[PDB]
Design a protein around this nucleic acid. Structure first.
Ligand SMILES: Nc1ncnc2c1ncn2[C@@H]1O[C@H](COP(=O)(O)OP(=O)(O)OP(=O)(O)O)[C@@H](O)[C@H]1O
Ligand SMILES: [Mg+2]
Lengths: 397, 309, 110, 110
RNA sequence: UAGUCGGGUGAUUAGCCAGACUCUAACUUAUUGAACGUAU
């Protein structure tokens, strides 16, 4: 026993929670809660937490077209460049499956994550017929490393490889158990790919779940396209209450925060509201100085609005104790950032997002040169024109 | 000549009782759990009393070759010798192996004893039955064909050094031609040199040589390769190397030792922490002996000789 | 439903409780249970079962307990494949039974 | 190259793509979409003109929106000439917002 | 710029004072067994 006390008094996180559970079965509870909550306001008026959370390194062995590969990532922004057939989508697919083991263990004790397919993800001519993926995360000077591995063997072979997932369960239990006694702010995870472009209709609703309770924010968050049909239903619920005229916020404040972010980021929308005088409920916007319903917008306009609106709702529900909810921790993945955008909008998208969301880590890809024209040179990674699965490390220009 | 008479003579017993006991020497083990320093358990198995005596006796009758670059489980040497050899070089590399003990089986041993570059001893073909029943563990009761080498048994260290003999022999001779230094502990590999862009090639060379000697049986753990230089932290088997090219206990451990002496000055310390403090000072004297000369200056020699055992 | 599934095939699974309809709206325990007990003559006088569920985001979890029910259904399935026996019946008739009859019985299958 | 093959008692399609052989579900999105346009248009013309020495020389009208979708800069520079070379007698109406596509077309057509 | 090494005060695992260093590039670990340092 004395060994845990000599570690805990030195500032180690995992030894403090071990004493709390063993002795509860109040000195050790406050050490756990303060490590998660401490921070200060900088000279520009932005809140910054004492302990950050992010990904440091990735590695791949006999996976799709790669024999062996390594890559190192930046704490703020990273951008990948190339042509058709070079592996850009296949990298984001490997990261997204790894994050699913955290989300499953915040919702339920002893939950289950996603798998690799034994039919299509193994390399076609590899002699040993199995594949592996490996990662490493950071969470401040209380614990400087957290490792994970996923693996699988080809269809019809006689010997099976195993995964190693326990270190992810150990961290996710601290966030789940401390939050039930007292309250804390929680992290965000999301993926957007090319399945975002789709048509819109009004005759639709879900009879599963409730759209006003805190844990709905994690529902279908790694699926590839956001549930914009849940945003409309939630925004109408806020209206019907506020019309009847600690640190939690009232529906009147929550409604005001979201409307300001939408008008600030999208170049050509200037106001939005709900109305219901005719017998039914509708959403209206002002666009080029004219007045329209959402179904009259062009595809380039609807796609950009749909992305910005869904992220803001999740940020506001998960951080109930901050003064400005858009400043919490998290990780976000986006593929093909210029889909449907005119060349005058393409050259300025990235810097608006980094202004509106100051503490998130972004990972992004593209195949056009105009988007880079304002970025610094330590944020960029690029493939060889000469490669055929030989390049074993990705590098800057 | 044969092992059964040799054991019966050295143990001073009748030889029929040796052959009667050895029939089921596998399965004579006890199993238990020990705690990790952060959270969780490690699982250990140890051989039953009396089977220990046969193992200690066997390692008297025979001897096997060992290369100079090995640093563990050998007499006269220790971890300070491993740390001292790299202390003059400004660049560093490290690597590791999967499941080092459990990966060894009778088929590996009987190949290595035969194909050797060195003077292995001869044996009677019929003694192989008794040799296998002395050296290996059967973990599963129904799968009677599984035999593996346990970490908890007195004979295992010697056998684990012998199996590496040609790997150490070749890789050291290769590094000497290019100004690179090599040493190996139980299962850590360490490389260093004083010129740039030479260390980048090495990981590829190891992976060819491993499958040439062992085939599928042992492999490199890809998740643990690390590079460092004079611009970042450097350590070897728990010992730190400073920018003045000398060995160190590190600032954080030095400051923690100062606190415990200050508790003793005012009589606030108690018997458990007093015993622990004496054990640390006995260790610290071997690695950084100039530290004690400063401690009996910041505190009186009068107080220091009272604390000392 | 747990007896019927185990007579037909080895392993198998029954039905389960629903998290958004069945749990009482304001109970501070945040979980719900249903419990039963059967009899099968002087040599096997008790067979208990429990079904359970709990709300999402809690510190702990509740599971079901069904092993004593699987054990009895395996005896009926194993003996019958060696030499034939009689088997039990289970049924439910609801208010939804009153509906019109379709005279075109053209459908055929084997 | 492209061909039909049989495995495990089932028929399936193979292609050779930059040096290697794959199934259709392994292609990138910029490769699939471009294949899907050309394969559909060729069938319909082969079925409708049975009495020409080359079925692809018949007549009609085709509409296309957003030619630049999923194509990188070196391909979107040249797509128009390859289409017009393969279907000599069709009338085309096309739309875009990228000025690279226009860099090889005469001023009357705009 | 920011990281890393550590001589000195300091009821001392904190804070503060002084002086140094950069190959894309450290993350402190396990007994009752084996080897080593110190008692007996
Ligand atoms: N199992 C496999 N074995 C070998 N090659 C494969 C395998 N699976 C896919 N490929 C190769 O993967 C490449 C496409 O990879 P991916 O779709 O990730 O690249 P991408 O072009 O950058 O994607 P995108 O631009 O749409 O984001 C193709 O060249 C294809 O031949
Ligand atoms: Mg000991």
């Amino acid at each position: 026993t004395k060994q845990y006390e000599r570690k805990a008094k030195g500032g180690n996180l995992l030894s403090a929670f071990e004493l709390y559970q063993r002795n509860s079965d109040g000195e050790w509870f406050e050490m756990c809660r303060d490590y998660i909550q401490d921070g200060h306001v900088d000279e520009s008026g932005i809140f910054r937490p004492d302990n950050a959370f992010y990904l440091r390194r990735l590695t791949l062995k006999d996976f799709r077209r790669f024999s062996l590969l390594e890559i190192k990532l930046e704490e703020d922004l990273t951008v990948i460049i190339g042509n058709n057939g070079k592996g850009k989508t296949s990298i984001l697919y490997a990261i997204a499956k790894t994050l699913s083991w955290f989300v499953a263990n915040i919702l339920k004790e002893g939950g289950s994550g996603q798998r690799l397919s034994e039919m299509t993800d193994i390399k076609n001519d590899a002699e040993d017929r199995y594949s592996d993926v490996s990662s490493t995360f950071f969470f401040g000077k209380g614990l400087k490393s957290v490792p994970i591995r996923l693996s699988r063997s080809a269809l019809g072979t006689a010997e099976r490889r195993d995964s190693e997932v326990k270190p992810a369960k150990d961290l996710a239990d601290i966030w789940r158990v401390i939050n039930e006694v007292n309250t804390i702010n929680l992290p965000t995870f999301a993926l957007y790919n090319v399945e975002r472009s789709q048509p819109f209709n009004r005759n639709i609703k879900d009879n599963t779940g409730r759209r006003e309770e805190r844990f709905d924010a994690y529902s279908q968050t790694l699926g590839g396209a956001g549930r914009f049909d849940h945003f409309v239903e939630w925004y109408i619920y806020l209206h019907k209450r506020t019309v009847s005229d600690s640190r939690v916020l009232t529906e009147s404040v929550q409604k005001s925060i979201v409307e300001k972010a939408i008008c600030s980021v999208v170049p050509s929308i200037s106001n939005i509201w709900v109305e219901m005088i005719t017998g039914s409920d509708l959403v209206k916007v002002t666009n080029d100085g004219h007045d329209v319903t959402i179904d009259q917008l062009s595809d380039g306009q609807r796609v950009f609005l749909s992305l910005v609106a869904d992220l803001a709702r999740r940020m506001v529900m998960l951080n109930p104790l901050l003064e400005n909810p858009l400043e919490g921790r998290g990780i976000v993945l986006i593929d093909e950032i210029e889909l449907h955008l005119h060349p005058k909008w393409q050259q300025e998208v990235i810097l608006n997002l980094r202004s509106a969301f100051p503490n998130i880590q972004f990972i992004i890809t593209t195949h056009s040169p105009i988007v880079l024209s304002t970025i610094e040179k330590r944020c960029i990674r690029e493939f060889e024109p000469n490669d055929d699965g030989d390049q074993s490390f990705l590098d800057s220009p | 000549m044969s092992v059964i008479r040799g054991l019966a003579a050295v143990l001073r017993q009748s030889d029929s009782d040796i052959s009667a006991f050895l029939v089921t020497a596998p399965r004579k083990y006890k199993v238990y759990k020990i705690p990790k320093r952060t959270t969780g358990f490690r699982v250990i198995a140890q051989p039953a009393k009396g089977l220990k005596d046969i193992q200690r006796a066997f390692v008297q009758l025979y001897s096997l070759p060992v290369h100079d670059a090995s640093m563990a489980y050998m007499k006269g040497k220790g971890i300070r010798d491993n740390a001292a050899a790299h202390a003059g070089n400004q660049y560093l590399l490290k690597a590791d192996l999967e499941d080092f003990f459990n990966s060894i089986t009778p088929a590996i041993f009987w190949r290595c004893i035969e194909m050797s570059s060195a003077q292995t001893p001869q044996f009677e073909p019929q003694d192989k039955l008794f040799i296998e029943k002395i050296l290996f563990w059967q973990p599963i009761k129904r799968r009677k064909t599984k035999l593996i080498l346990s970490v908890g048994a007195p004979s295992s260290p010697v056998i684990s050094n012998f199996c590496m003999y040609e790997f150490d022999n070749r890789i050291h001779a290769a590094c000497k031609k290019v100004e690179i230094t090599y040493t190996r502990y139980a299962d850590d590999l360490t490389f260093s040199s004083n010129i740039p862009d030479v260390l980048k090639a090495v990981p590829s060379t190891l992976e060819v040589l491993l499958k040439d000697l062992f085939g599928s049986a042992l492999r490199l753990n890809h998740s643990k390769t690390v590079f460092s230089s004079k611009a970042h932290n450097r350590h070897v088997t728990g010992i730190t190397i400073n920018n003045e090219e000398t060995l160190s206990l590190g600032r954080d451990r030095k400051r923690f030792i100062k606190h415990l002496i200050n508790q003793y000055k005012y009589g606030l310390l108690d018997n458990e922490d007093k015993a622990y403090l004496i054990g640390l000072l006995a260790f610290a004297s071997h690695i950084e002996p100039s530290f004690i000369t400063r401690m009996n200056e910041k505190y009186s020699l009068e107080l220091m000789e009272r604390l000392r055992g």
